[PDB]
Amino acid sequence: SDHLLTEISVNHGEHKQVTLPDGTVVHLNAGTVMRYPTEFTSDIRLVEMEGEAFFNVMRDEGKPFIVRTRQADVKVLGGSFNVKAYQEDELMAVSVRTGKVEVDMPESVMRLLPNEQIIVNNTNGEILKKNEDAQKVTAWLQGGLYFNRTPISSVIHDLERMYNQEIVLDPNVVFDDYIYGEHDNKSLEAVLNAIQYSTGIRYRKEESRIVLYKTS
């Protein structure tokens, strides 16, 4: 007896770590699913994932490592990078710590170097390649938060997943804020207070939910 294929799922509020058969180390963020084989095929090292993970890929220049998501294939020979691709999110991002990374989509193929990032907007189809501190992007590894012109909906999803908390918007209020912020491991209430400071977004408890709102 022996398993050939495994699926690891991460709940909201938690983290998981996996060493793959090739020696690649994966850090899986809250709400992530990853399918991987107990032995890789001879031609590539393929994994399937939905959510967010940080990969530390074992260099093998004759056997590419592929992170397959619904929207893209992230291919390396070696390196370390973050893939953020939650099904519920409007954005997708691939950020490189070390190594060279190819992000392959039907409409674009881009090769990224350390501290380069690709942001794909699943709504309007806009793609952006820019420079970004990969250490800040991977702040979730140490339970931190990093927002750089991040839409409020992505901020809410990040908070819901990190703290395993339902966060709901007040239907009377308009929310189209872009958040800027950097938080060390803090409580949800400390982060919501920091967001209140820079946006005026207030929060209230309604049973098991947190309701966000604004007022004049």
Using the contact rule CB under 5 A, the part of the chain among 40-48, 97-105, 171-179, 206-214 near Cl ion is 97-105
Residue 148 in the binding site for Cl ion (CB under 5 A): no
Using the contact rule CB under 5 A, the part of the chain among 16-24, 96-104, 132-140, 187-195 near Cl ion is 96-104
Q: Taking CB under 5 A as the criterion, which residues in 173-192 touch Cl ion? A: none
212: CB partners within 8 A, 6+ apart: 156, 167, 168, 169, 170, 173, 175, 201, 202, 203
Report the Cα–Cα distance between both ends of the chain, in Å, rounded: 65
CB atoms within 10 A of CB 213: 16
Q: Taking CB under 5 A as the criterion, which residues in 20-79 touch Cl ion? A: 78-79
In the complex with Cl ion, the residue whose CB is nearer, 77 or 188, is 77
Question: Is the separation of the CB atoms in 75 and 101 below 8 Å?
Answer: yes
The binder of Cl ion chosen from 24, 65, 94, 99 (CB under 5 A): 99
Shortest Cβ 19–Cl ion spacing (Å): 17
Type of residue found at 37: P
Q: Confirm or deny that 31 is annotated as ligand binding.
A: yes
Shortest Cβ 3–Cl ion spacing (Å): 30
Shortest Cβ 99–Cl ion spacing (Å): 4
> How many degrees, rounded to 5, is the angle at CA 58 between CA 55 and CA 62?
120
Shortest Cβ 16–Cl ion spacing (Å): 23
- Measured CA to CA, the distance from residue 118 to residue 128 in angstroms comes to 6
In the complex with Cl ion, the residue whose CB is nearer, 31 or 99, is 99
In the complex with Cl ion, the residue whose CB is nearer, 31 or 79, is 79
Shortest Cβ 22–Cl ion spacing (Å): 14
- Measured CA to CA, the distance from residue 88 to residue 103 in angstroms comes to 20
In the complex with Cl ion, the residue whose CB is nearer, 98 or 150, is 98
Residue 98 in the binding site for Cl ion (CB under 5 A): yes
Strand partners, 18: 26
Task: Label the pairing between strands 209-213 and 167-169.
Answer: parallel
* 3-state class (DSSP) for residue 161: helix
Report the interface residues with Cl ion, using CB under 5 A: 78-79, 98-99
Residues at the binding site for Mg(2+) are 31
